[PDB]
Design a protein around this ligand. Structure first.
Ligand SMILES: Cc1cc2nc3c(=O)[nH]c(=O)nc-3n(C[C@H](O)[C@H](O)[C@H](O)COP(=O)(O)O)c2cc1C
Ligand code: SF4
Lengths: 216, 56
């Protein structure tokens, strides 16, 4: 059991399950710790009710996005394993399991990472993939080989060496890792690239265009 | 051919057709024995995605 889950249990016993279930939406009960980091004025850790909207949490406890809310580019809501969401989704999304699942991003550890409009999103996702490549235990074939493969592909994506067709290839590669490994680390490596391709494909395409035009 | 015009006329009268137009021996209208390199396209299964072997 997670330490937060173990640590909230005596309070639940003392005050009752009804008190804990009074907070949040149905099937999303209780309070939660949030770590807001990245491009915020006041990165911090707070305790808040579950279904709090993301924008309200960011602008109330983290001092708002650096440069204003209109400077927001993307948010990773639940740690590196969750897919990122663009600014248009963060306007009304709530911070619980169900709402973030409907947003195709998941809640995870409730670790909000904020990236503003000055962020190279491709570089950030490639750094996350490098982290997963360095953290893979190597036991099973899909993680051990495919995560390294996607790391190389994303490293080439950062410069722009690749061709647009490879993007689809990358997608398929991630699909061959997800659901085919012993543990969920493979899923946690496959999902960030899926989110980046889902929401920022034109950025990758224009990077490849600029690389081709610069290097004949 | 190198035949003199009188021999050409004799050949054409004997055969009944103009032989100089369609000669059995090929002189210089054939292709060069040295050619530029080719390129040779690949094929329909050379895609990078949506190409699972179980579908083909
Ligand atoms: C690669 C990987 C790393 C994980 N690391 C942690 C971790 O550091 N701490 C943690 O509490 N759970 C971690 N988890 C999730 C554990 O499965 C989880 O702690 C466990 O299921 C406890 O369940 P609980 O959240 O109901 O208490 C990790 C899962 C994966 C796949
Ligand atoms: S998916 Fe899990 S078990 Fe398989 S290689 Fe990666 S870390 Fe090891």
């Amino acid at each position: 059991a997670n330490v937060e889950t173990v640590a909230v249990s005596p309070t639940i016993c003392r005050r009752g399950g009804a008190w804990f279930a009074s907070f949040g939406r149905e099937r999303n009960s209780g309070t939660k710790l949030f770590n807001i980091s990245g491009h915020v004025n006041h990165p911090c850790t707070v305790e808040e009710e579950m279904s709090v909207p993301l924008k309200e949490l960011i602008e109330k406890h983290a001092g708002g996005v650096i440069g204003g809310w209109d400077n927001l580019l993307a948010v990773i809501p639940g740690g590196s394993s969750t897919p990122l969401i663009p600014k248009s989704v963060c306007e009304t999304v709530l911070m619980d399991f169900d709402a973030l699942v409907q947003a195709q991003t998941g809640l995870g550890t409730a670790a909000v990472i904020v990236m503003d409009r000055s962020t190279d999103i491709v570089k950030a996702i490639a750094r996350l993939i490098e982290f997963y490549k360095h953290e893979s235990c190597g036991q099973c074939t899909p993680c051990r080989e495919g995560v390294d493969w996607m790391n190389k592909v994303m490293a080439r994506f950062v410069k722009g060496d690749a061709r647009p067709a490879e993007i689809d290839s990358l997608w398929e590669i991630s699909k061959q890792i997800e659901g085919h490994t012993i543990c969920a680390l493979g899923d946690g490596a496959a999902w960030p690239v899926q989110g980046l391709i889902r929401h920022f494909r034109p950025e990758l395409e224009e990077r490849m265009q600029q690389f081709a035009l610069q290097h004949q | 051919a190198s035949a003199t015009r009188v021999i050409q006329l004799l050949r054409n009268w004997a055969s009944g057709r103009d032989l100089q137009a369609k000669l059995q021996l090929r002189y210089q209208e054939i292709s060069k024995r040295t050619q530029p390199p080719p390129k040779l396209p690949v094929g329909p299964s050379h895609k990078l995605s949506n190409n699972y072997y179980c579908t083909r």
